[PDB]
C-alpha cells in the first residue's frame, strides 16, 4: 500500500463528492465478480460514465473518514464489507433502482441495502425518481384538468 500522502487523497477526493453530490446507495459484494463491475460501469456509463463511482473502502477508517463530514448516518453502514456509490449530476435517480434489480438477479447480497442519504435515513427501494422530468405527469395534469 501507500503511506498517508495517499490515504489522504482517497479522502480529499472522495469526500468532495459528498460535499458536492446528489444521492447515496448501498451494497455488500461478497462474491463480487468482475462481470459485476464491468456491467455497473456501463450503468455508470448510462448514468453518465465516470460521474459515479463505487470505490470499495468500507474501512470506516476511509469512507467514514469522509462521513463526520456529511452523511453521519453511515457510522452504521460502514461495518463489514461495503460498496459506497455517490452521485454528482443526474436525478436523485435510477442508481437506486438497479442496485435492487441487479442484486435481485442473484448478483450477490445488497447489505439488505442498509440504505443512505438524500433525506438522512435508511432503507426502501424507491422509483420516486426519474419520473423526474415526468413533469409531463404535470403536463397531462393540465389539459385533463382543464377538460375533465
Amino acid at each position: 500500500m501507500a503511506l498517508n500522502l495517499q490515504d489522504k487523497q482517497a479522502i480529499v477526493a472522495e469526500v468532495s463528492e459528498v460535499a458536492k453530490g446528489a444521492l447515496s446507495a448501498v451494497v455488500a459484494d461478497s462474491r463480487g465478480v468482475t462481470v459485476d463491475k464491468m456491467t455497473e460501469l456501463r450503468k455508470a456509463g448510462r448514468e453518465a460514465g465516470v460521474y459515479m463511482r463505487v470505490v470499495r473502502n468500507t474501512l470506516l477508517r476511509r469512507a467514514v473518514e469522509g462521513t463526520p463530514f456529511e452523511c453521519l448516518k453511515d457510522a452504521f453502514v460502514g461495518p463489514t464489507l461495503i460498496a459506497y456509490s455517490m452521485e454528482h449530476p443526474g436525478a436523485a435517480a435510477r442508481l437506486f433502482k438497479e442496485f435492487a434489480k441487479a442484486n435481485a438477479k442473484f448478483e450477490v447480497k445488497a447489505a439488505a441495502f442498509e440504505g443512505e442519504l438524500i433525506p438522512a435515513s435508511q432503507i426502501d427501494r424507491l422509483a420516486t425518481l426519474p419520473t423526474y422530468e415526468e413533469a409531463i405527469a404535470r403536463l397531462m395534469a393540465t389539459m385533463k384538468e382543464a377538460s375533465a
Binding site: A135, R138, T142, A146
Partner: peptide, 30 residues
C-alpha cells in the same frame, strides 16, 4: 383563472426553474 394565459407560458419555459418547482406542485394538491 385565465386558462390560455396559463398555457402559452405553460408549454414554453426553462429547466432548473421546474427542477426546484414540481417537487412541490404535488403538495398544495394531491
Amino acid at each position: 383563472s385565465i386558462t390560455k394565459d396559463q398555457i402559452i407560458e405553460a408549454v414554453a419555459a426553462m429547466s432548473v426553474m421546474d427542477v426546484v418547482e414540481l417537487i412541490s406542485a404535488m403538495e398544495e394538491k394531491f
